[PDB]
Write a protein that binds this ligand. Structure first.
Ligand SMILES: Cc1nc(=O)c2cc(CN(C)c3ccc(C(=O)N[C@@H](CCC(=O)O)C(=O)O)s3)ccc2[nH]1
Ligand SMILES: Cc1nc(=O)c2cc(CN(C)c3ccc(C(=O)N[C@@H](CCC(=O)O)C(=O)O)s3)ccc2[nH]1
Ligand SMILES: *c1cc(=O)[nH]c(=O)n1[C@H]1C[C@H](O)[C@@H](COP(=O)(O)O)O1
Ligand SMILES: *c1cc(=O)[nH]c(=O)n1[C@H]1C[C@H](O)[C@@H](COP(=O)(O)O)O1
Lengths: 264, 264
């Protein structure tokens, strides 16, 4: 989509070569922001084919508060397999922090129903935030939160969200991370009787792995297609009540898929 | 500064009227990014005289892990007075989270020592982060962290920093918060023998209070002037050892100060 392909060109035009944790090497920029108006269409990348099925299941998993991959395995999603231990555990990553952030005096905060209650009862709050960056449990996590912190905002009956992604693999994770949060914004807005506004993506270390260069130029030679449309077929009683079958993407005609190795 | 006045105008042309928690009223936008190259000069606003003494003592108060305004008073800095209790405490705000984030099991993480050790031993890390947004202690704080989360980055021997500020009073808090983190970048870079890079500012709810319209219009009438340069006179033996006397600003020629009421 125009924003995404301009980001790729930007990393190529001004990225600095950097060595990294996995030993693969990246081309990197620091600091970027893009905005997607969710009323223009659902932001699912069309210059390569993305698997919506994996995106939806991972988001339903996060919302259930789950951090073990068995659910994802029951649904034929293997995107988190490489970081899971022998028991299928990833440690207190996203789902646990969203649904049960532990306090130092023995409580657990459910940040997702806190946010829902804020949007319903106090939508002009400047504190409507969900953080996955829990400094005291970072060491128990298989991988530190890439999409770390996000904030909601309501203006003129529309819900907007801004995500700070501290680390971003542009080719592989970012198509998935944009679609996932746009989906979350449609579900929140449906629960609060709000319209969808903007998804704003802000990035920290935004990079392209050295072994993704050919597939990046191949993708960069393609014209974006019209954006698909998201249809939710049901309003569940709670945001924790949605299921895969409630969503319908319409009009998605992508270019061929492009395979790329994930750096572990 | 060009970017600062540009944001100021953008909030006026684009802002939506919001009833906020103080019953004052704001015009706000959501999602904004600004980039300051620290090689070009220290970003202290010149279209109004800013008081650097207050900026320095607050940042030094933060690095000492102190949340009691007694120290600020010892140095006659009055900025946090309206939020402290009968004993001068603000609760576990900025300073406490930066130097002793409480783990669920009773320990504390010093995020500043962690960051110094990462910049020295692993500068390619994509995890060099300080979070003041401690979900389990927010209810104890007099005001929730405005400048909430920040990340360091190193490329080509230069140290960059991005701040995510979830709530921003453009006229009062922002000149102050920008100078504050530019200063911290200069001190970290000196301790880690790096050159300064970019200070990237990203805002969430970015606003102008209804009772600052006149002084915002006054400020928008003034030509920005060349940026000052910062000199750190002494190299302390740790980042916890700077003192007010070690910093000099040079070439700071501002337009006259502009007085404006704070919303409490
Ligand atoms: C280096 C690295 N980059 C990543 O983007 C990344 C992503 C996740 C998890 N995640 C959020 C994923 C999103 C997309 C993925 C992926 O493997 N995509 C394949 C297709 C998988 C499928 O069939 O659905 C692809 O798009 O080619 S994995 C975990 C660690 C990571 N590590
Ligand atoms: C509504 C609100 N807006 C703020 O910007 C704000 C800022 C702080 C703390 N802070 C970050 C402060 C920075 C600057 C301030 C101020 O009143 N400045 C005056 C005079 C003080 C001085 O610097 O000598 C000025 O800049 O002229 S207060 C606390 C609560 C807030 N509340
Ligand atoms: C992490 C997880 C996700 O959902 N999407 C992402 O883009 N990533 C990427 C970022 C980086 O390339 C790697 C995580 O490694 P690190 O912790 O930043 O070193 O996966
Ligand atoms: C908070 C403190 C700071 O250092 N900088 C800021 O700009 N502010 C402002 C933001 C907002 O106007 C107010 C805090 O109120 P709220 O918690 O956002 O409702 O102070």
């Amino acid at each position: 989509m125009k924003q995404y392909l301009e980001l790729m060109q930007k990393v190529l035009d001004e990225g600095t070569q950097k060595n990294d944790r996995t030993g693969t090497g990246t081309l990197s920029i620091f600091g970027h922001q893009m905005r997607f108006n969710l009323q223009d269409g659902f932001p699912l990348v069309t210059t390569k084919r993305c698997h919506l099925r994996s995106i939806i299941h991972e988001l339903l998993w996060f919302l259930q508060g789950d951090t073990n991959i068995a659910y994802l395995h029951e649904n034929n999603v293997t995107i988190w397999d490489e970081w899971a231990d022998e028991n299928g555990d990833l440690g207190p990553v996203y789902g646990k922090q969203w649904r049960a952030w532990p306090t130092p005096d023995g409580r657990h905060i459910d940040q997702i129903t806190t946010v829902l209650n804020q949007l319903k009862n106090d939508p002009d709050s400047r504190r409507i935030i969900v953080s996955a960056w829990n400094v005291g449990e970072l060491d128990k996590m298989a991988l530190a939160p890439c999409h770390a912190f996000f904030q909601f905002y309501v203006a003129d009956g529309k819900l907007s969200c801004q995500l700070y992604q501290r680390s971003c693999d542009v080719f592989l994770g970012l198509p998935f991370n944009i679609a996932s949060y746009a989906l979350l914004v449609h579900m929140m807005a449906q629960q609060c009787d709000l319209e969808v506004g903007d998804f704003v993506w802000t990035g920290g270390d935004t990079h392209l792995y050295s072994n993704h260069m050919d597939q990046t130029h191949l993708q960069l030679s393609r014209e974006p297609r019209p954006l698909p449309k998201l249809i939710i077929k049901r309003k569940p009683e709670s945001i924790f009540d949605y299921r895969f079958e409630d969503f319908e993407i319409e009009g998605y005609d992508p270019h061929p898929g492009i395979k790329a190795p994930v750096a572990i």
